[PDB]
Design a protein around this ligand. Structure first.
Ligand SMILES: CN[C@@H](C)C(=O)N[C@H](C(=O)N1CC[C@H]2CC[C@H](NC(=O)c3cccc4ccccc34)[C@H]21)C(C)(C)C
Ligand SMILES: [Zn+2]
Length: 90
């Protein structure tokens, strides 16, 4: 099961980005879709399922790509994107 079931909703995750500092650079919509919510501190985000945290986002970073790069064992990532996608990033 998810590490943090309470952030399993994409809409709740999107709502968490109300004070996101990088709107143009790394869209909240893409982050939320990729399982991430904003912790509220700097640009630190975390996946509701694997609880993997990421920060220091660069402009044009792709949330799904970063998810697979750093947390390839995440089952939310697997269910959403499939194994071929994860394999191709690694
Ligand atoms: C350039 N793209 C970004 C998304 C990226 O690759 N981020 C990386 C990144 O955040 N991580 C790589 C794998 C993990 C391990 C440590 C990094 N996580 C963190 O530093 C972190 C993220 C979110 C909340 C946190 C709260 C308290 C401490 C740390 C922390 C994360 C980077 C190491 C900072 C470069
Ligand atoms: Zn995850």
């Amino acid at each position: 099961g998810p590490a943090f079931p309470g952030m399993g909703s994409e809409e709740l995750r999107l709502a968490s980005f109300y004070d996101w500092p990088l709107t143009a650079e790394v869209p909240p919509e893409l982050l939320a879709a990729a399982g991430f919510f904003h912790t509220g501190h700097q640009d630190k985000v975390r996946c509701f399922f694997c609880y993997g945290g990421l920060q220091s986002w660069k402009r044009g970073d792709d949330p799904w790509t970063e998810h697979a790069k750093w947390f390839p064992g995440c089952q939310f990532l697997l269910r959403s994107k499939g194994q071929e996608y994860i394999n191709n990033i690694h």
